[PDB]
Design a protein around this nucleic acid. Structure first.
Lengths: 451, 81, 93, 98, 107, 98, 83, 107, 93
DNA sequence: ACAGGATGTATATATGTGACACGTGCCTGGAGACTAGGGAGTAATCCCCTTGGCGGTTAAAACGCGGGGGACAGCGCGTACGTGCGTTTAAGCGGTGCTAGAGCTGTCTACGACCAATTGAGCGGCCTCGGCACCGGGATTCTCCA
DNA sequence: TGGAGAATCCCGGTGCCGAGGCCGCTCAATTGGTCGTAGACAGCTCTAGCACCGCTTAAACGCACGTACGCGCTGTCCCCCGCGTTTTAACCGCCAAGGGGATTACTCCCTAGTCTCCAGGCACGTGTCACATATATACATCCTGT
């Protein structure tokens, strides 16, 4: 309901006003998602120092219209209630109504459409935005037993007493299907069931993480960055962000983008994120490690960067590649073929009158490629082709022969291979002169691939 | 990504293909059967086209790769190279 | 004159897979013709692959692509693995 | 009283119309999307020349027209005029594809 | 120096040298790489081993220790991939797969 | 009081016997004379290796057996069991030989 | 002498044996002539190509290799007679 | 030493020199005879003239002055010998030969 | 850079057969592909003939036999006649 | 069968325009004239293997007789497809922009062809001993007439 | 629903012509060099593939209705199958005759390779008309009452 306290808060036109509103909404067992969601969306969409004029009348009108639509479309008396458990048909109808609110012309992945402020005032909404709109409407409906589920990329809504029943209410960038089939395929879109289970605190975390300060391809808004910094730091002071590794990574990125005294350095927050991934999700998240690796890539320290990328490969070792999770493949392809070649080239140029001459850096690179190869094996779709082979040969070339020779491939640091393709390189490479033809022939072979 | 675009091969399009082939009445399941047949043929051709493209170390599937794949399958095509 | 055949090598492979199973002369002729025909197919496809790309040499990569083109499915996968293993062992020695 | 032709005459006129012409009978954008979706399982992030998709479309239309000619022969053989999936399967089996 | 066949160096039963000579003299290209005969001989040995293992199993399913063209055809036609490979060929002295259609057989 | 069999069963016994074996189903001498006459039509005074005629016989028998499998499929298609010449023509037209 | 027909040597029982190997129960009476026509056509093509291969090599005897090459031209590879 | 083209000497229109070069670089045989390119050029010119004569007839039957793929396909399919030669060949943008089954017709 | 084609020769033949008929660009490309395909068939068959028979060169009679094997029916007879006429005219002077 | 109502489509005339046929610079590949070396033509020889005939066995083909199983035609019906129509949806065209990657040019370096040496392997004969079909008796299993 | 019939397999002894092993012995695969050049790699640069938006209108869609046709059922008959008898030509074995497939040796001539030179075929640019499209006229054809 429209609380009198929430109206008495009287949010003014100030960032600290938004922070205080978030703090007040985070004192109850269930914060008003649509209220804070619409406020953040309005500020972003209007902006995307002339602070947006916060108008309680327009927000109230939009909230009333949304509530009327949700109540008229979805009524509790139309379906049975199991004494505090929501049924599948209820959530299915909620999702159907939320999708029917949209139009035929899709968003085309356009930016600034990740919040409910645009969705209520328009007919465009992205996948995560659609799932969060479903959750917010369900919460306004009084069905609190349902919760949003976040994979690394794909977002959906879980429900039931303990979240035992799942339904991917939103497409992949189709309303009700189980997640067990997707987990059975060992695909990164589902994290093998290790996706986080989000509560309303985590919903506030998602709303603050989803803010996109990019005005366009070139220009950004500093006020949005400062807002996100304040909100994220407050929510971390609450401790809620602790379970959300992407939140810690984004907060560290903001901190390094603009330092703030009295708060831990970005590297500490990155390590805290990777540790939260290490404990709570059975070391299955990938983006924490790529956050840390990108942070090291920003600076001229390639040892830890390659170590983090090798760690990312060890994370991705277990999965199987399919057409569904193309995004992780595109990020690994970018990393392996555009940033590592350039990073090693710059390091070699610095060496030519160190980053190279270190056996450990070479071992990290070999473990990264070994993780990629292990990822490929057993996958329905092939991962490696000539585009990978040329840059792998180049990257092995950047290292000197005697440097590579101080490496031990068992079963200078010791390093073992879990992948079948690298069982030939275990002697083909780590020789005085690299045989490019054999390496490319071994890599580009379509073995260890199912179809 | 792209999903369930096999339905883009519409029932009217299949009917036009059949009429060119010269059939008068078309049962109601010929559409699903023809979609399966077309998907199989396309997969068979595209695999060889992609193999020819990879061997040339290119990222773009040329018309010569397609005509080579068809020639390999025994379906020579005239007018593209 | 000398007649070239794979009878010796087919017999050695048979003894490798079936130690106590013999092979008839007609079955040996069938296997010899099979090896000749498959060799001709693979080498001819490699020749076409060389010609298409304006390359004047047949190398292991073109043999591998010809094997991907000719052999179907799991045959292609395992034959490719076997070829890569043999070439890797040859080069490293 | 509206005039409606007896069933099976518009079909004959369409047979004549589509055998007299040479237009690509499948729409171009849906077929391009189908080709890309199919190729997206042999190698990620491919690119296609427009001539490549046109070649695929010409080949596929010719293949399906030939297949429907064989299917029509099968249907007539069984004392029918309508083609049914058993006719397509028989034609594919006899040609050795299946 | 001590002699050593390339077949033994790559761990192959098939003749790498003879395959190299055939690739050179067969007019497939102006040049042939050093690893091409090794790759081709490995593939040929793999295919021969596969078909001979299947033929030996078929002969063993017949209480015979001598492979005959009938067993070669049984092995080839009972394999869903070798059948596609040897689709246009006919093994001499080999019969046909025992197959009477269900609708043909009375119930 | 003779005891006989249904016409169906002896046909199936023949099918079993002739599918378990590898023997040549055409007598050698008539086939050899046929081959020699067909060659006589082309070039005169021609001689044949014994292996040549044996190879021709293997190929011809395999071809006819494959054709009869396809004809059996055609006859089953028309809801029959007897194979009739129209079935042979259908198989040969679909396979592209006519 | 010049052979007259010799096509009837492909006998009715032989055609029935070939059909039974194909897995067919009943045989219509006109199959015995349709199949003779089919076999004459097939042999005419294969023998034409084998005689061409022989005559090109300035031979007078049709080798088994000529027959297997003629079959391979038709897309009907034959195993066991060289190649 | 005035130069007269081999094609002109042979009385053809197709290029004898280009055909000879293609035979040489094409990897067909180690050596290529002198009369082989002339023979192949004559055969290619004959086949082209045949199919173009039929195509020109087909184009005139439609009251047109240009040969398009449709006319080439009509020429190919209506002639039994050229149809047999170009059996598995697809003539792109050529349509199909107009023909309806007699059964599927109200007479 | 430079691209080789049979377009000028196809046009010469067309002008000498149908003096008043032009040809489209797509039809020209189809005829060019036809000439290339037939050339490849005849050359590949001639190579196979010169390898089966223990020879190393491709002569006029290898091409003649390849034409006799590939071209069906009366196409073969007329093509052989034209080729022999061309060769006799060539070697005459 | 035959004549009107309505029909999609054939016949005829015209503007546009974008592709087709032609002219030009030129440069790249083809033509003309030695050189030489090996492939192929030619002739004599061996002897393997093809053709041709005789002669007896018995396997298989040819022929005729029920007879009953399956092909073919006619009927009925009921259902699933074609035909039209108004509504919805996305193809198609047309700009506008970005940039990835195809095609190409210049190094330059590693790899395949040639060649001399020769030695261990793979092929042509020649035993020799076991695997497999033949024969023969016993057990089994599915199948038309009561 | 229970008895006679015809294959069909399981098990034991055999002696055989074919695969496996042994013996020479050449010959071609291996070793080691050079040496030229094919392609590997880097940088560049233009082009054409991808993406996006907006309008138009062609085409897909959902629906109702009639009805042509697919399919099941029944009846008749005809013609294919199984069986017994005769017969006839395949087949196995043997013996001759010779011709034509392989092989070798000599030589000669024909094609690869090189060099010089030039002209014809390709890229670029330009007139221009063949054919597509729109409308006005027209005309065989399909459906239905006669």
């Amino acid at each position: 309901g429209l609380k009198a306290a929430q109206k008495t808060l009287f949010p003014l036109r100030s960032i600290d006003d938004v922070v205080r509103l978030f703090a007040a909404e985070l004192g109850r067992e269930e914060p008003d998602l649509v209220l804070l969601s619409l406020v953040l969306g309005f500020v972003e969409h209007f902006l995307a120092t002339y602070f947006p004029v916060a108008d309680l009348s327009i927000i109230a009108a939009l909230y009333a219209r949304f509530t009327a639509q949700i109540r008229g479309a979805v009524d509790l008396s139309l379906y049975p209630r199991e004494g505090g458990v929501s049924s599948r048909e209820l959530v299915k109808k909620v999702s159907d109504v939320i999708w029917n609110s949209l139009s035929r012309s899709y968003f085309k992945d356009r930016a600034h459409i990740q919040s409910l402020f645009s969705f209520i005032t328009g007919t465009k909404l992205d996948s995560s935005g659609v799932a969060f709109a479903v959750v917010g409407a369900c919460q306004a409906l009084g069905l609190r037993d349902v919760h949003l589920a976040l994979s690394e990329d794909h977002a959906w809504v879980v429900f039931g007493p303990n979240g035992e029943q799942t339904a991917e209410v939103t497409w992949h960038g189709r309303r009700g299907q189980t997640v067990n089939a997707g987990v059975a395929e060992r695909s990164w879109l589902y994290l093998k069931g290790s996706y986080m289970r989000c509560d309303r605190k985590m919903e506030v975390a998602f709303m603050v993480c989803a803010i996109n300060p990019s005005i366009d391809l070139h220009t950004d808004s500093l006020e949005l960055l400062q807002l996100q910094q304040k909100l994220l730091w407050l929510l971390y002071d609450l401790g809620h962000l602790e379970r959300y590794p992407m939140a810690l990574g984004n907060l560290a990125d903001l901190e390094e983008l603009e330092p703030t005294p009295g708060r831990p350095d970005p590297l500490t927050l990155y390590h805290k994120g990777i540790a939260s991934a290490k404990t709570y999700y059975r070391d299955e998240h990938i983006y924490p490690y790529m956050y840390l690796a990108g942070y090291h890539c920003r600076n001229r320290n390639v040892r830890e960067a390659l170590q983090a990328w090798a760690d990312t490969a060890t994370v991705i070792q277990d999965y199987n590649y399919c057409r569904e999770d193309e995004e992780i493949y595109k990020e690994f392809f970018e990393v392996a073929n555009d940033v590592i070649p350039n990073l090693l080239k710059e390091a070699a140029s610095l060496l030519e009158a160190s980053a190279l001459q270190d056996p450990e850096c070479f071992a990290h690179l070999l473990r990264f490629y070994d993780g990629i190869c292990k990822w490929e094996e057993g996958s329905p779709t092939p991962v490696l082709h000539v585009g990978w082979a040329t840059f792998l040969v180049q990257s092995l070339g950047r290292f000197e022969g005697q440097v590579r020779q101080k490496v031990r491939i068992v079963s200078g640091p010791v390093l073992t291979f879990q992948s079948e393709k690298m069982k030939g390189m275990k002697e083909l490479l780590v020789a005085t002169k690299i045989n490019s033809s054999a390496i490319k022939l071994q890599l580009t072979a379509q073995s260890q691939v199912q179809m | 990504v792209l999903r369930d675009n096999i339905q883009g091969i519409t029932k009217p399009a299949i009917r036009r293909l059949a009429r060119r082939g010269g059939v008068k009445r078309i049962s109601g399941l010929i559409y699903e059967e023809t979609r399966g047949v077309l998907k199989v043929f396309l997969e068979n051709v595209i695999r060889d086209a992609v193999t020819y493209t990879e061997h040339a170390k290119r990222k773009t599937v040329t018309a010569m790769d397609v005509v080579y794949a068809l020639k390999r399958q025994g379906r020579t095509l005239y007018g593209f190279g | 004159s000398r007649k070239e055949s794979y009878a010796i090598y087919v017999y050695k492979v048979l003894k490798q897979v079936h130690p106590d199973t013999g092979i008839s002369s007609k079955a040996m002729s069938i296997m010899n013709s099979f090896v000749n025909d498959v060799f001709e197919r693979i080498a001819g496809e490699a020749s076409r692959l060389a010609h298409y790309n304006k390359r004047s040499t047949i190398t292991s990569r073109e043999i591998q692509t010809a094997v991907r083109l000719l052999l179907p499915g799991e045959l292609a996968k395992h034959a490719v693995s076997e070829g890569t293993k043999a070439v890797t062992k040859y080069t490293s020695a | 009283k509206p005039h409606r032709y007896r069933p099976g005459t518009v079909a004959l006129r369409e047979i004549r119309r589509y055998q007299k012409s040479t237009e690509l009978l499948i729409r171009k954008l849906p077929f391009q999307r189908l080709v890309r979706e199919i190729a997206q399982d042999f190698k990620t992030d491919l690119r296609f020349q427009s001539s490549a998709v046109m070649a695929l479309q010409e080949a596929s239309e010719a293949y399906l027209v030939g297949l429907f000619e064989d299917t029509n022969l099968c249907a007539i053989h069984a004392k029918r005029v309508t083609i049914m999936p058993k006719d397509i399967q028989l034609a594919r089996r006899i040609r050795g594809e299946r | 120096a001590k002699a050593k066949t390339r077949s033994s160096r790559a761990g192959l039963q098939f003749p790498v040298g003879r395959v190299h000579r055939l690739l050179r003299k067969g007019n497939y290209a102006e040049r042939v790489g050093a690893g091409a005969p090794v790759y081709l001989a490995a593939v040929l040995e793999y295919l021969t081993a596969e078909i001979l293992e299947l033929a030996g199993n078929a002969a063993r399913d017949n209480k015979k220790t001598r492979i005959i063209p009938r067993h070669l055809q049984l092995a080839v036609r009972n394999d869903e991939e070798l059948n596609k490979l040897l689709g246009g060929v006919t093994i001499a002295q080999g019969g046909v797969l025992p197959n009477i259609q269900s609708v043909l057989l009375p119930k």
